[PDB]
Amino acid sequence: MLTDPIADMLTRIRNATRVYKESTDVPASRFKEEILRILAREGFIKGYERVDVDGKPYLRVYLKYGPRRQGPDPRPEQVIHHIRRISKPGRRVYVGVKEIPRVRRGLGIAILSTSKGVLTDREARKLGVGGELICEVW
């Protein structure tokens, strides 16, 4: 049993990107889904999809990297350089609309669950809500 499934996904992703996979399966959940939707909108992932690895439902996430580079070590630049869980179980982290993080001076997002749904830092600022700071990505 996975202790935190949001973090297992944020990670699965991070591990995949770091070896430049094409895509990767994370087991399905509306919430995980709700998050990836945002990753797509902001362009951190090409897309997601509801594949079905042997009977049980997964989310094929498709990754997006940079172009090839010149020099020793061509490996392209990650589009997701950094993706970290802010609120973890046994240390939940809620912020009010007044103290929602400015991530990398905004060259990056923070994803927070609110009573108005899963939103980005700029999305919650407009709507005027806080919630549970789930992760920053930049």
Binding site: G43, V79, L107, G108
Partner: protein, 150 residues
Amino acid sequence: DFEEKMILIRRTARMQAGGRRFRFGALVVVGDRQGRVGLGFGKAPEVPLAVQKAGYYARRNMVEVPLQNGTIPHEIEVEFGASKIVLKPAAPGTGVIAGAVPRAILELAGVTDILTKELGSRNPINIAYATMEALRQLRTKADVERLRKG
């Protein structure tokens, strides 16, 4: 053209039968003060030789720094080995509030307002190497746009 600062010089020692044999290391930054700097480590037999050689090495491995009004696009921390530099951007007037090693580097790139913290070990050689890897990693809103774009 390029200015050179020379962050540190040192005198290392090797062991020989009867006596120990010396040499000199020289860390040097070069910069144009409008967005280009390079860090050079130059080791050699005589001081001024290794200073000179360090300068040359420093003109390879330049970094293009994205100065946004004398400062940084975002903030990074970098850990280089056991050292850790922390760069934080600042509004005009702030000046370079930084160590001696990263001031030298930052100043020659053109950064004229920045916040800075040296963390972890303080070995100047590594702190410099990290400051540089920091500048190397700065993206800007424009580069990030290119990356995400589909």
